[PDB]
Design a protein around this ligand. Structure first.
Ligand SMILES: Cc1cc(C)c(C)c(S(=O)(=O)Nc2cccc(-n3ncc(C(=O)O)c3C3CC3)c2)c1C
Length: 288
């Protein structure tokens, strides 16, 4: 599309912001607030519409995990509710295959989900599919060649370096090669034939390292590290480059946005968000 949308997040409390960054001119636009504040959500796009999935409203009033699915139409600058998921899912990951939204893992209080469910926009319906082999919150999710990958996270006891792949026509999950780093709350995305995992928390430190999985070789390789360590970052791809947005570096809720050029294997700072925050949802679609 043309703009990078960032929805929600956390700073002092869960946020309702929807802001759109335009890489062509450096500008940020503030758009219609989410109806309910949420951090730990995920964003995705189907048919030009932006969806916000799951998360949690951490507020002074209290703290409520979200099962919600909401749809933002850039033409109208309006959010509409969709059908809710079977369960609340904070610290969720999502991926889109063939116009359907897969919601993966996440938490409902102390419940760490392995369950996975699929949304069909044409019917406004969710249905459960086979669960993952592992409970995963803070799970990175990406789609490559119409297969769904769940990467890292936290299973209730340990942060994970494991990853697995969902084969839709078999409704089956299988482990893939584990990452070389334990990562929970990483940013995961796809670029060319690789799944990238950037940042996260390894149980001790927020990470700046970045590694990628080549589906043909089934191996993970480190690339250039980000300039800033970060967990609970937003991540997306725009014209062949990876953008990482915000996160937490152990000291500060970051406003930094970095951009990875895979041809030069370099990261550069490209803009700052209007305020530091973590736990955002991010996706790319047409300008409003
Ligand atoms: C109060 C508070 C404080 C801080 C520092 C943050 C970041 C958030 S937050 O909204 O950004 N929360 C969030 C979003 C996405 C993923 C994760 N997440 N999932 C698993 C783990 C882990 O520690 O294993 C994490 C952590 C490593 C990132 C967590 C909140 C509410």
């Amino acid at each position: 599309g043309r703009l990078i949308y960032t929805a929600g997040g956390y700073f002092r409390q869960s946020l309702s912001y929807l802001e759109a960054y335009n890489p062509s001119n450096g500008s940020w636009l503030r758009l219609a607030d989410l109806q309910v504040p949420r951090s730990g959500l995920a964003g995705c796009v189907v048919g030009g519409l932006l969806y916000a999935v799951g998360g949690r409203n951490n507020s002074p009033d209290g703290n409520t995990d979200s099962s919600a699915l909401d749809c933002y139409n850039p033409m109208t600058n309006q959010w509409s509710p969709c059908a809710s998921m079977s369960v609340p899912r904070n610290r969720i990951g999502v991926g889109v295959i063939d116009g359907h939204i897969y919601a993966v893992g996440g938490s409902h209080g102390c419940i760490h989900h392995s369950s996975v469910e699929r949304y069909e926009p044409e019917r406004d319906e969710w249905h459960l599919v086979a669960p993952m082999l592992t409970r995963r919150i803070g799970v990175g999710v990406a789609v490559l060649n119409r297969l769904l990958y769940a990467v890292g996270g936290f299973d209730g006891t340990n942060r994970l370096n494991s990853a697995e792949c969902y084969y839709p026509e078999r409704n089956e999950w299988r482990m893939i090669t584990p990452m070389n780093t334990i990562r929970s709350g990483a940013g995961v995305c796809v670029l060319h034939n690789c799944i990238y995992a950037a940042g996260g928390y390894d149980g001790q430190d927020q990470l700046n390292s970045v590694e990628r999985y080549d589906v043909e070789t089934e191996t993970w390789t480190f690339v250039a590290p980000m300039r800033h360590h970060r967990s609970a970052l937003g991540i997306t791809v725009h014209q062949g480059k990876i953008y990482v947005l915000g996160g937490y570096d152990g000291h500060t809720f970051l406003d930094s946005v970095e951009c990875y050029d895979p041809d030069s294997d370099t990261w550069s700072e490209v803009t700052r968000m209007t305020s530091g925050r973590s736990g955002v949802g991010v996706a790319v679609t047409m300008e409003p």
